[PDB]
A = this chain, B = another copy of it.
């Protein structure tokens, strides 16, 4: 008694893309006058990266970008997300502009446009100039202005061709992995410093959004957040959830998600979380107060939200925990990647519905999604990455379902176009749809490349 409803289509113009970051692919770490970044410094020290790997060569993309753009054209990408290395432009962070750095991004952007691929630029993907770290890095309030001057130089240079700009990639990682856990550059280990960095990143973001809007620059500006939907083990077990468990697991999830979403989309930090941190002597009251006032004063709503989604977390209340919240993580049965991350496409759907229901209307791009498997090249030069294909297929379909349920999703960027340097894990994690043989720098298209090629064709 119900006439067939057609499948929900991806909308016309949907940006099917792939994503990379400068330090992870470019190599050429000291070439053409490029300054030292915090990642150059970090990987050149012992005991920071698995196997002593570094990004000195990486995928050699600074040299091989033309081949890579040819592969993007073959794939049929609508868009390519990449980051600009600040140290190629301003080797010391500020001062004299390095013309050879501008010439590289000129050539890359021109090549993308020549090939009909929309460039999407991340301004900051973790590679702060070491000379700025020498004066405190993101903890130094003057950083906001140095970042702003860099960002506006490149926006003004490339705005004719680059219409979508991402201020920051994954500020959770920049702040907490870089300045609390110290497992990312610059390797600092101080929670209060990390919260200072959170705030610098938010003010930096707003300053760029404000300049773009006030000067009526015809580009869109957003920010990319890694979001982790949180589920209760107690509910998986079918038990009754206590008030204290709900509250503590909620607060723990606010550190991951709302700490960044709320300032960006609502103009305040999540007050219950700041209160908790003050009450636990993890954040000074005076700082909690000033950071809340400064976000209120400087808030401006952005043009889009970028989401990086890989997995979920399952948590429960545990007074014995050593974490900054009394929680532990549990291990639902299922399929896991080489990162030890659960394959959970339902989490992408749930997260997108939650954004739609909990925040003001805004265009959403999935700026990263992908999986690491231990790829083997066959004798006949193939990579039969069937599990990566299954992962992508299921997440693409979760995105379609989100669109069917009214989420304003406007693009989807697979992490990554090519295997690359995975930060403190070195080259040991391969996320590409293209395999890179690091001995030869040969690009080998994986089965997932051909899968995605056909998926784009069928969904555009």
Interface residues of A (CB under 8 A from B): 47, 50-51, 233-234, 236-237, 239, 316, 319-320, 330-340, 372-374, 387, 428
User: In the bound complex, how far is the Cα of B422 from the Cα of A237, in angstroms?
Assistant: 14
A388 to chain B, nearest CB (A): 10
Residues of B within 8 A of A428 (CB): 233, 237
Lowest 7 A-B CB distances belong to which pairs? A331-B340, A333-B338, A333-B337, A336-B336, A333-B373, A47-B319, A237-B428
Q: In the complex where A47-B320, A237-B374 touch, is A336 in contact with B339 (Cβ < 8 A)?
A: no
12 pairs of residues in contact across A and B, judged by CB atoms under 8 Å: A51-B234, A51-B239, A233-B428, A236-B374, A330-B340, A331-B337, A332-B338, A332-B374, A333-B335, A333-B336, A333-B373, A335-B335
User: In the bound complex, how far is the Cα of B239 from the Cα of A330, in angstroms?
Assistant: 32
Q: Are A333 and B374 in contact (CB under 8 A)?
A: yes
Residues of B within 8 A of A236 (CB): 374
Residues of B within 8 A of A336 (CB): 331, 333-336
Residues of B within 8 A of A233 (CB): 428
A276 to chain B, nearest CB (A): 21
Residues of B within 8 A of A237 (CB): 374, 428
User: In the bound complex, how far is the Cα of B316 from the Cα of A233, in angstroms?
Assistant: 30
Q: Are B337 and A387 in contact (CB under 8 A)?
A: no
Residues of B within 8 A of A239 (CB): 51
- The residue of chain B having its C-beta at the shortest distance from the C-beta of A183 within the complex is B320
User: In the bound complex, how far is the Cα of B47 from the Cα of A320, in angstroms?
Assistant: 7
User: In the bound complex, how far is the Cα of B316 from the Cα of A236, in angstroms?
Assistant: 33
Residues of B within 8 A of A234 (CB): 51
Q: Are B335 and A331 in contact (CB under 8 A)?
A: no
- The residue of chain B having its C-beta at the shortest distance from the C-beta of A233 within the complex is B428
Residues of B within 8 A of A372 (CB): 333
* Central interface residue in A234, A237, A239, by most chain B CB within 10 Å: A237
Q: Are B320 and A331 in contact (CB under 8 A)?
A: no
- The residue of chain B having its C-beta at the shortest distance from the C-beta of A320 within the complex is B47
User: In the bound complex, how far is the Cα of B210 from the Cα of A245, in angstroms?
Assistant: 52
Inter-chain pairs besides A333-B373, A334-B335, 7 sampled, C-beta below 8 Å:
A331-B336, A331-B337, A332-B338, A333-B338, A333-B387, A335-B336, A336-B336
User: In the bound complex, how far is the Cα of B340 from the Cα of A335, in angstroms?
Assistant: 11
User: In the bound complex, how far is the Cα of B314 from the Cα of A428, in angstroms?
Assistant: 14
User: In the bound complex, how far is the Cα of B330 from the Cα of A428, in angstroms?
Assistant: 11
* Central interface residue in A233, A236, A333, A387, by most chain B CB within 10 Å: A333
A429 to chain B, nearest CB (A): 10
User: In the bound complex, how far is the Cα of B333 from the Cα of A339, in angstroms?
Assistant: 8
- The residue of chain B having its C-beta at the shortest distance from the C-beta of A372 within the complex is B333
A409 to chain B, nearest CB (A): 27
Residues of B within 8 A of A334 (CB): 335-336
- The residue of chain B having its C-beta at the shortest distance from the C-beta of A340 within the complex is B331
A308 to chain B, nearest CB (A): 20
A407 to chain B, nearest CB (A): 29
Residues of B within 8 A of A332 (CB): 338, 374
